[PDB]
Amino acid sequence: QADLAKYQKDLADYPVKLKAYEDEQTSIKAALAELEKHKNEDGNLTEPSAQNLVYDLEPNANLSLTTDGKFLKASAVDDAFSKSTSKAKYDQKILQLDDLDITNLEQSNDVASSMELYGNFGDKAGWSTTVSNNSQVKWGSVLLERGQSATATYTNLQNSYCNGKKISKIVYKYTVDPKSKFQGQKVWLGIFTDPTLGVFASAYTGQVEKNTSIFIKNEFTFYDEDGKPINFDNALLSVASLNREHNSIEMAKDYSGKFVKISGSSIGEKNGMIYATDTLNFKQGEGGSRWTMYKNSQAGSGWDSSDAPNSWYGAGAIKMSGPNNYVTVGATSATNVMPVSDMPVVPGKDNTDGKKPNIWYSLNGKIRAVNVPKVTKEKPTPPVKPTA
Amino acid sequence: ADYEAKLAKYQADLAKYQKDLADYPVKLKAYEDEQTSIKAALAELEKHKNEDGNLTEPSAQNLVYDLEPNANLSLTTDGKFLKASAVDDAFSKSTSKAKYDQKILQLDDLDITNLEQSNDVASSMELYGNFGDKAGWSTTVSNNSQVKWGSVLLERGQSATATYTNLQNSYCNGKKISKIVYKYTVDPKSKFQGQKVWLGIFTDPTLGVFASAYTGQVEKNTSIFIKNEFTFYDEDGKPINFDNALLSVASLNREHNSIEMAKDYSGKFVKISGSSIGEKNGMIYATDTLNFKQGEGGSRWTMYKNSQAGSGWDSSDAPNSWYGAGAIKMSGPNNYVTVGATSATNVMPVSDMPVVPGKDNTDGKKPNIWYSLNGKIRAVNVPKVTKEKPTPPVKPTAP
Amino acid sequence: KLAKYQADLAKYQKDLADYPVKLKAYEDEQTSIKAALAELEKHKNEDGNLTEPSAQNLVYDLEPNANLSLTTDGKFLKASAVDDAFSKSTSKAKYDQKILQLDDLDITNLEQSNDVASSMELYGNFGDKAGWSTTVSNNSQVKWGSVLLERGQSATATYTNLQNSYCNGKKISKIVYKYTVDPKSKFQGQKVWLGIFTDPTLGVFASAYTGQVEKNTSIFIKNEFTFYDEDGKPINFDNALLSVASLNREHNSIEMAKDYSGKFVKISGSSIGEKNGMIYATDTLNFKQGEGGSRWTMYKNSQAGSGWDSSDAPNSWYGAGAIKMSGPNNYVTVGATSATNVMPVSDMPVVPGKDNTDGKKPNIWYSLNGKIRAVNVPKVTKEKPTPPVKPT
Amino acid sequence: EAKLAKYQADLAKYQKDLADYPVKLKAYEDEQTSIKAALAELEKHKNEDGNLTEPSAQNLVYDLEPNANLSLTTDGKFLKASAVDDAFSKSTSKAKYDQKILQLDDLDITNLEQSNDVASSMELYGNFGDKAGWSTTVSNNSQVKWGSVLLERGQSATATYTNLQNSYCNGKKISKIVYKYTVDPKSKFQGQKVWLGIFTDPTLGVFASAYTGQVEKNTSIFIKNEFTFYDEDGKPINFDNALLSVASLNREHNSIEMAKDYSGKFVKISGSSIGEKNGMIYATDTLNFKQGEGGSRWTMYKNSQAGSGWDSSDAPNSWYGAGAIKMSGPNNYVTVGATSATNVMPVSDMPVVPGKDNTDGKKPNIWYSLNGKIRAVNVPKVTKEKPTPPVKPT
Numbered sequence A: 001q002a003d004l005a006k007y008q009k010d011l012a013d014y015p016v017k018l019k020a021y022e023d024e025q026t027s028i029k030a031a032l033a034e035l036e037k038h039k040n041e042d043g044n045l046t047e048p049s050a051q052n053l054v055y056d057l058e059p060n061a062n063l064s065l066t067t068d069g070k071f072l073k074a075s076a077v078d079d080a081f082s083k084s085t086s087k088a089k090y091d092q093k094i095l096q097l098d099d100l101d102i103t104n105l106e107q108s109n110d111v112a113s114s115m116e117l118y119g120n121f122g123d124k125a126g127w128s129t130t131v132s133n134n135s136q137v138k139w140g141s142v143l144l145e146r147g148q149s150a151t152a153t154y155t156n157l158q159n160s161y162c163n164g165k166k167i168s169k170i171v172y173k174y175t176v177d178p179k180s181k182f183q184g185q186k187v188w189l190g191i192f193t194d195p196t197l198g199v200f201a202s203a204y205t206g207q208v209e210k211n212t213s214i215f216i217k218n219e220f221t222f223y224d225e226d227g228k229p230i231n232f233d234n235a236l237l238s239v240a241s242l243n244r245e246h247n248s249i250e251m252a253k254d255y256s257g258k259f260v261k262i263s264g265s266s267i268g269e270k271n272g273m274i275y276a277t278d279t280l281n282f283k284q285g286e287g288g289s290r291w292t293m294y295k296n297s298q299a300g301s302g303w304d305s306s307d308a309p310n311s312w313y314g315a316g317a318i319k320m321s322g323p324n325n326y327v328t329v330g331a332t333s334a335t336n337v338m339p340v341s342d343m344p345v346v347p348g349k350d351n352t353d354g355k356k357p358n359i360w361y362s363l364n365g366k367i368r369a370v371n372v373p374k375v376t377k378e379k380p381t382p383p384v385k386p387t388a
Numbered sequence B: 001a002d003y004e005a006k007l008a009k010y011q012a013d014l015a016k017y018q019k020d021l022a023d024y025p026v027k028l029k030a031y032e033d034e035q036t037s038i039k040a041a042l043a044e045l046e047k048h049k050n051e052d053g054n055l056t057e058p059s060a061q062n063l064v065y066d067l068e069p070n071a072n073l074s075l076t077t078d079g080k081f082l083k084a085s086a087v088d089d090a091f092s093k094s095t096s097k098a099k100y101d102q103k104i105l106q107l108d109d110l111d112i113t114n115l116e117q118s119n120d121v122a123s124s125m126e127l128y129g130n131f132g133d134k135a136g137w138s139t140t141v142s143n144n145s146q147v148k149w150g151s152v153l154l155e156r157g158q159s160a161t162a163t164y165t166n167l168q169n170s171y172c173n174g175k176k177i178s179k180i181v182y183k184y185t186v187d188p189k190s191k192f193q194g195q196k197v198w199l200g201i202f203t204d205p206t207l208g209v210f211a212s213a214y215t216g217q218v219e220k221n222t223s224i225f226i227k228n229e230f231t232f233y234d235e236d237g238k239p240i241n242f243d244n245a246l247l248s249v250a251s252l253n254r255e256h257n258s259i260e261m262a263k264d265y266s267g268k269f270v271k272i273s274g275s276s277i278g279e280k281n282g283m284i285y286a287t288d289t290l291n292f293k294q295g296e297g298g299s300r301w302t303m304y305k306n307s308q309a310g311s312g313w314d315s316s317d318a319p320n321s322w323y324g325a326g327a328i329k330m331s332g333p334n335n336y337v338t339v340g341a342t343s344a345t346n347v348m349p350v351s352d353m354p355v356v357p358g359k360d361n362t363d364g365k366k367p368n369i370w371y372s373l374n375g376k377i378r379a380v381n382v383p384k385v386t387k388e389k390p391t392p393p394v395k396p397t398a399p
Numbered sequence C: 001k002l003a004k005y006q007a008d009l010a011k012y013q014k015d016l017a018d019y020p021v022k023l024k025a026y027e028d029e030q031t032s033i034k035a036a037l038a039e040l041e042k043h044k045n046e047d048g049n050l051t052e053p054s055a056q057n058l059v060y061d062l063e064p065n066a067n068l069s070l071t072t073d074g075k076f077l078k079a080s081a082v083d084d085a086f087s088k089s090t091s092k093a094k095y096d097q098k099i100l101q102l103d104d105l106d107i108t109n110l111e112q113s114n115d116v117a118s119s120m121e122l123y124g125n126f127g128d129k130a131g132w133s134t135t136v137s138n139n140s141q142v143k144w145g146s147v148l149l150e151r152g153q154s155a156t157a158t159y160t161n162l163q164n165s166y167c168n169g170k171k172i173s174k175i176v177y178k179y180t181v182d183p184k185s186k187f188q189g190q191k192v193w194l195g196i197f198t199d200p201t202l203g204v205f206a207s208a209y210t211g212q213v214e215k216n217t218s219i220f221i222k223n224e225f226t227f228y229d230e231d232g233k234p235i236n237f238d239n240a241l242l243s244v245a246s247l248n249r250e251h252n253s254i255e256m257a258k259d260y261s262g263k264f265v266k267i268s269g270s271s272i273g274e275k276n277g278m279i280y281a282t283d284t285l286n287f288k289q290g291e292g293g294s295r296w297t298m299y300k301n302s303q304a305g306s307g308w309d310s311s312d313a314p315n316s317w318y319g320a321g322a323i324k325m326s327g328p329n330n331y332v333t334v335g336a337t338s339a340t341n342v343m344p345v346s347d348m349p350v351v352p353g354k355d356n357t358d359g360k361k362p363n364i365w366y367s368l369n370g371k372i373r374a375v376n377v378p379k380v381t382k383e384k385p386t387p388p389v390k391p392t
Numbered sequence D: 001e002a003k004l005a006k007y008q009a010d011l012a013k014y015q016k017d018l019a020d021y022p023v024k025l026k027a028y029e030d031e032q033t034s035i036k037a038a039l040a041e042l043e044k045h046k047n048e049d050g051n052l053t054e055p056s057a058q059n060l061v062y063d064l065e066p067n068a069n070l071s072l073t074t075d076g077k078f079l080k081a082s083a084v085d086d087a088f089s090k091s092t093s094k095a096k097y098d099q100k101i102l103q104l105d106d107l108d109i110t111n112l113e114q115s116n117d118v119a120s121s122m123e124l125y126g127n128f129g130d131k132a133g134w135s136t137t138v139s140n141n142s143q144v145k146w147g148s149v150l151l152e153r154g155q156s157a158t159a160t161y162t163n164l165q166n167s168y169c170n171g172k173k174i175s176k177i178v179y180k181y182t183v184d185p186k187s188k189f190q191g192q193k194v195w196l197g198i199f200t201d202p203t204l205g206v207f208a209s210a211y212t213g214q215v216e217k218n219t220s221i222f223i224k225n226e227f228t229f230y231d232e233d234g235k236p237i238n239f240d241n242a243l244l245s246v247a248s249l250n251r252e253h254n255s256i257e258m259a260k261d262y263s264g265k266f267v268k269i270s271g272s273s274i275g276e277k278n279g280m281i282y283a284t285d286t287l288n289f290k291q292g293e294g295g296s297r298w299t300m301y302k303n304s305q306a307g308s309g310w311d312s313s314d315a316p317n318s319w320y321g322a323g324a325i326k327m328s329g330p331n332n333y334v335t336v337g338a339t340s341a342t343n344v345m346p347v348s349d350m351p352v353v354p355g356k357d358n359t360d361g362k363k364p365n366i367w368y369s370l371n372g373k374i375r376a377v378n379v380p381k382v383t384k385e386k387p388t389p390p391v392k393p394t
């Protein structure tokens, strides 16, 4: 049919595609050869590896959402943000997600028929958030009980590829782990339209909680332009911003694939859990922490930043394969993880202090090790000429 | 005994040392006199810092970088080079065709859909503009003055790197600039509906770049943003560490429905007194008024020249150019800034916007922008630092 | 009470000692005033002279140290909020040059709910803004309290701590002055910012300006005032001359007074006259020399006689008139209006290059005081003294 | 025959004037040559300490009039020498009074506000008569006399100075000066009255005080000065680029002495603390009270330190606290006063002196003078008028 003109163009373009593929392969192999000489230096993967999951930022993605919980009205999200422990920041045109008291989301009058978006856009453009400051973020919100879930279909992806195949759709299921130890009965899930931004999960009702935890199970499958699942092939899933304070541990567990250590990172694997195993990582000098997670006077501080060079201090990876992968990410009181005997002691700070049962987390391909070569080009197949 | 070759070397170095030593007092006196003049000028400018067109904090300009019409441009990219054939063809069709048929290259009317075919791709950069068989044509850049640009087609995250050489008039803190390496990257946060961006990178580095995602229709809630990372090099190919250099961020147009801005920049914002341009939330733009038409949206002057006094401020010759300009004080060898255009609704709510009768602030805009980053600071009477403090020559030791 | 019949008798002794001096001062001031009026009757039709010669018994020119108290049925505005509004929108530019440009203030940023205060707060080029400039009196210090009013709403100002002002020789100790937004004003918004200056002779700035000029627009403030003496007793004006000044008329805008007690008094040669119960530039503009029949330019420039719109300008009278007033309670509405609201385009002066239908900002600065702009008007400062009474 | 005698005496007076005309003309031409050479020389030193930035001669010779006679009118109250002396003997003043010192800046004017303090005519007071040998803060051991008035805001006193002996303007002898002092209504002193001590020597200026014994925050006293100079014939003398010395503008950490609302143009002395900003002449950028404090180069009172005592009438570095006003025309004016620093600028903008509160209250008083004693160095004086040849009587 008219297939022969697309064959002509594909054939004219095949040598360029092939040379690009071979050049990138050459560069990747040279980069890995060099990285083998620094694999035990700070910020490097201990086992050198390329990244074939190019998946760092999708700010223009469109989000669709199903749930067996309740959708929340954007009105209700706004109202809850305007009250209780968040109200202060709300009055300074700041959306403080970790201060949101979800008690004001639990009325039945707050429930919507479909997902509605909220964030620092629209009539709140120019506000900033705790997620990306004044960069614009939008999220749909659901209210879940233990065991209930929300399924997010992200489309309109523009920058993400898997071993050179374009990722056109991501279907992600967030489930509230029933073994979570939060004192409340509901969880607010703010699912960002950008899938690389992950989710904010909160059972916070305005007071801190001892021996508490919130854990979200994540099951995801990636799809190409044909709606065909993409089988991961030693893809590197970035698990980053695993903060550990003196009284709180952010961790991942129950995951497919193999933990991948970043050399010099506080994050390691112990008893099937990925977290800061031996030191804190909140403030320099406290509990063996090398750097401060927020920015201040000290050099190397502010590592809990997406663009921070020493981001890797709070990050690790998971080597994954297959089309369906999963991992549970959450926050838990230190006492749930280990006895107080085993804990680092920080002068003036009680390890038994309560913590807010909330967490912001994301799972993407933005691996935090340095000089990780990306696999962006697929080996092209020769075009076939159509039959007349 | 081949200590004769070293002896000839030593003797010619000993004559060059003697000439350098003969010229050192003159160089030192010139440097000290320029320092005296600059300090007196800054002391004088401190008395006008709250008057129209003056820097809020008086400062000298040690980045002499306004004019390089003869520069040579080489270009790398991870996108696709565009043939001059293809650029011409795209200019000859669609929303651009009209002006093309009047022998005018209207860059902001170019529909880049006719640049997205693969037969349009070249293996190396090709130049296009109002020269050759199009000499005498007009462009929206410098009217009929001759301009040339190379073209690339990039997706989000892709980039083009421009090496400008053959520089003739540019200096930084008195060190002559011999090479500029400049990387233009398509910001993935751009909100244009397409997937491609045409970059026209002008051979004159002071002319900046034209970026366009325009496909023939305006777009609501749209934006195009280009990240710029640059390093300047001297005669020896050694990077030049900026020392409070003033990078002019100029012609930041704000219409009723669209804002041109700079953000994510190294250095600190430098205000021009009375300018529409200020800084808010880490972005440099017309924060509180428009600057398109006198009387519309609080703007003091009209950007195009007409009957009204002070109009045509969006020109290079315009004495009130500073009305649409600001600066960035920068230091270090590697500097960066993202410049772009975005629909007003992306920046602030309609509640907060200036109201212009008869014009919808939510109107779509073309996702394109022309911008340039140079040393042509638009404040008035800014003294230039042209002379570098000389080091005494060292005597060579005999062989 | 036995001690007071010695303090009143000691204060009587001094009152009796100065009564001859007070009486001599009164009688010569009377002589000088009568001679001045006799002379002025010979120039009453010369430029800058009152058409009907008259003395000024309202000494009321400058009260920079007066204290201002304020009630309202509108909303008080926080000084913080006023500052914030000045820092934004059409004023921001001048604000960043340490200038408070009152006629450029976009009052939309005063209409938020946090902007309201429980009591009047002062703002101006004082305090942490000392050394700043205003469009009111340039580098001189001015302070004003601010309210946000709807049509028909009002603010009442009590000025005390007056130091230099007198009425029929009687010292003025208190002025009560009510500003009301005329509901017939045609501005496009629903709110008006009132900046009421602590110096009552500086009047008020009224603005409905929202960042855009407006066609067929107007802002009008009703003024009802009563003056009080030391004993807190109202003072009955007796042909007092109220100066209605700086009535600017551009090609598209007319500043005027109307609905006033008393009778208009013309200054000979002034652009200002009375027509259809309104006091304004009746026949010519007064903005630029040669434009619309205007003799002089209101701002200072190249031309002789320019800069008439100044307190110290010798030809200020070109934009001023008077109102002869009597009684204790007087009133007048002052405002600005688009020329199209006053007369058809048929009747308007034609200025090449300028559209008479151009929109204008719905704001105005005005003041009503005793600084009559006619020349050589003798002032009545001395009261005829009453003989003291002896206590018993 | 009765008028042929007058024609003969006019013919001898013409004969005399004609005999003196060549000498007068040669003297004038020689002084013009000397002044032009001096200005040519001064232009090469115009940016050195103590020099006028734009070199100029001084044609207002007006330094010293100790024998001048003063007459005074007012719309306020004349003060008796009785009352001035009594007030000097009491309150914040009394101490210095007991050591035979008249300390004007310590005078509590509260004891001038009673009614038998009032006189029908000006009366003089000072370190003369039974107080000869006393000291004043004006000229210390030199004899000075002043008449005193009590004014409210807007009230004024007009001084006619005659019997002038040493002062000239563009070569014309000054025979009379009429000078009006008005209390600026914008003054912020807490009081309601001002004492004006107007010295018989017009070059000594005036002392203005609203001081009632306590310092005042956010305070100010300002006196408006309007003056016209007259020649032998009673004709006003039209100034022609005369230099009016605006001097002793002291700026402490909490107080600024300044001039404003002036006819003419400000003239800067190179290296002086005094400059012009927003139409006001004062120490614009540094204090000038004590060396090292607030950027001040020298100490205003005399002590050990070199260059100190600059606030002196003879001090060679007088120019450190001085500027000038180039004036023309017959009627000139300027308002001089003292004001709390907070009235001029925010504390943010103020020079910082450790241990000293910039918001401290100050006494609302000031001594100032406006004369021709220009404090820049080597300013050539213009003493000779171009003479006109006499005309012969008929």
Ligand SMILES: O=C(NCCc1ccc(O)c(O)c1)Nc1ccc(O)c(O)c1
Binding pocket: A056, A057, A098, A130, A131, A196, A197, A240, A241, A304, A305, A306, A360, A362, A364, A366
């Ligand atoms: O790395 C992070 N998060 C920084 C930690 C943080 C910052 C501020 C807080 O207020 C806060 O609670 C936590 N964020 C990120 C975002 C998007 C990504 O695509 C991505 O790959 C990583």
Ligand SMILES: O=C(NCCc1ccc(O)c(O)c1)Nc1ccc(O)c(O)c1
Binding pocket: B140, B141, B249, B250, B251, B252, B313, B314, B315, B316, B318, B320, B321, B322, B323, B324, B325, B326, B370, B378
């Ligand atoms: O240097 C320039 N560039 C030309 C701007 C322009 C753009 C598109 C056109 O179509 C056009 O005609 C002109 N003029 C300028 C720059 C910076 C300024 O702040 C400013 O106020 C004026």
Ligand SMILES: O=C(NCCc1ccc(O)c(O)c1)Nc1ccc(O)c(O)c1
Binding pocket: C135, C136, C244, C245, C246, C247, C308, C309, C310, C311, C312, C313, C315, C316, C317, C318, C319, C320, C321, C365, C373
């Ligand atoms: O002296 C005043 N008021 C202040 C002067 C002024 C300052 C800034 C302005 O923007 C402005 O409009 C007016 N009234 C006056 C002056 C001149 C007249 O011809 C007259 O009739 C009244």
Ligand SMILES: O=C(NCCc1ccc(O)c(O)c1)Nc1ccc(O)c(O)c1
Binding pocket: D105, D137, D138, D246, D247, D248, D249, D310, D311, D312, D313, D314, D315, D317, D318, D319, D320, D321, D322, D323, D367, D375
């Ligand atoms: O010499 C004078 N005026 C009299 C000095 C004086 C004033 C008040 C006193 O209380 C006092 O004791 C002495 N004027 C002057 C002096 C020094 C200067 O640097 C300058 O610019 C001007």
Ligand SMILES: [Ca+2]
Binding pocket: A240, A241, A242, A243, A250, A360, A361
């Ligand atoms: Ca975290």
Ligand SMILES: [Ca+2]
Binding pocket: B251, B252, B253, B260, B370, B371
């Ligand atoms: Ca532009």
Ligand SMILES: [Ca+2]
Binding pocket: C245, C246, C247, C248, C255, C365, C366
């Ligand atoms: Ca007016």
Ligand SMILES: [Ca+2]
Binding pocket: D248, D249, D250, D257, D367, D368
């Ligand atoms: Ca002094």
Ligand code: NA
Binding pocket: A130, A131, A132, A360
């Ligand atoms: Na975040």
Ligand code: NA
Binding pocket: B140, B141, B142, B370
């Ligand atoms: Na251009």
Ligand code: NA
Binding pocket: C135, C136, C137, C365
């Ligand atoms: Na005014």
